[PDB]
Design a protein around this ligand. Structure first.
Ligand SMILES: COc1cc(Nc2nccc(N3CCC[C@H](C(=O)NCc4cccc(OC(F)(F)F)c4)C3)n2)cc(OC)c1OC
Length: 287
């Protein structure tokens, strides 16, 4: 049994809300450990269930246990909740807030304006997603937790239609997310909250490009050398200046020159107030 500390409080496996296996039902798959839609009884509470393969290393179990603790201590509306766990039956379950809208990247890619739906997304939708994730990032900075993989693929959406809310919902050399990392993270291997400020800038790019891979025509090592020598991505198609300027400020070479999330939020709001920003048309992808 390992312990875990966060916001000054310590907790162990035994502090997790163990839900009885008999109160949990799986309805269908979602993704590939492996995750299911399901529901919990007292009308049923609708949940996502992440499972632990019964064939797994002793390290995998420990990581699963630890992950359960880590998620359970977060208390913020823009971070996917832990409903509880079912550890005492096999296979073991972690129970999470069901996010009906899926991951942000996939969502963006399928909702890119086209001739059939020319005004499916507006700038304000993108600024609200940006805002939601920054607010979560601000929670993590306040509480001294460094995510290390703030990317579109690791953010989830409550629903697809309007009123959607986005939330940090996943943890995420060849596996390292090089395109989301600042210079000082390959160089010295050091991490601070200004790490996440950088990755957020990249997230911004992803949001305003409507789901493109960052640094389009570039491999990991190419991006490393490019970024290390002070090179940066261009503005995504139709991207307003004020929004791009937030990205370039997130990508300052000097950690100390990057804004904290309070300042990021302030600047995402200003953007949200500017009519030249919010009246800009998103590009239509030609189908
Ligand atoms: C991405 O796949 C889908 C996910 C969902 N919805 C969903 N809702 C809740 C959870 C969930 N998961 C699948 C992706 C991985 C995710 C997970 O394990 N998250 C870990 C986690 C959870 C909460 C917080 C957290 O910490 C932090 F915020 F720091 F990342 C880390 C669990 N997926 C829905 C879909 O269709 C609508 C999907 O496409 C088929």
């Amino acid at each position: 049994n390992p312990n875990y500390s966060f916001a000054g409080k310590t907790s162990s496996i035994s502090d997790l809300k163990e839900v009885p296996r008999k109160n949990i039902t799986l309805i269908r798959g979602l993704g590939h450990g492996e995750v299911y839609e399901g529901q919990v009884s007292g009308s049923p509470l609708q949940v996502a269930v992440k499972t632990l393969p019964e064939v797994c290393s002793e390290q995998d179990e420990l990581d699963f246990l630890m992950e359960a603790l880590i998620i359970s201590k977060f208390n913020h509306q823009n971070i996917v909740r832990c409903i509880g766990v079912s550890l005492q039956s096999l296979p073991r379950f972690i129970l999470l807030e069901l996010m009906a809208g899926g991951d942000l990247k996939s969502f963006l890619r399928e909702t890119r304006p086209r001739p059939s739906q020319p005004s499916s997304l507006a700038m304000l939708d993108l600024l609200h997603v940006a805002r939601d994730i920054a607010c979560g990032c601000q929670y993590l900075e306040e509480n001294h937790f460094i995510h290390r993989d703030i990317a579109a693929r690791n953010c989830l959406l409550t629903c697809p239609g309007p009123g959607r809310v986005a939330k940090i919902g996943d943890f995420g050399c060849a596996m390292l997310p090089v395109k989301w990392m600042p210079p000082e993270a390959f160089m010295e291997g050091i991490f601070t909250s200004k790490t996440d400020t950088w990755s957020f800038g990249v997230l911004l790019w992803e949001i305003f490009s409507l789901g493109y891979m960052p640094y389009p025509s570039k491999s990991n090592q190419e991006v490393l050398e490019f970024v290390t020598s002070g090179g940066r991505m261009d503005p995504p198609k139709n991207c307003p200046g004020p929004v791009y300027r937030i990205m370039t400020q997130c990508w300052q070479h000097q950690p100390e020159d990057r804004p904290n999330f309070a300042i990021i939020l302030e600047r995402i709001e200003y953007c949200t107030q500017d009519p030249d920003v919010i009246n800009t048309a998103l590009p239509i992808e030609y189908g």
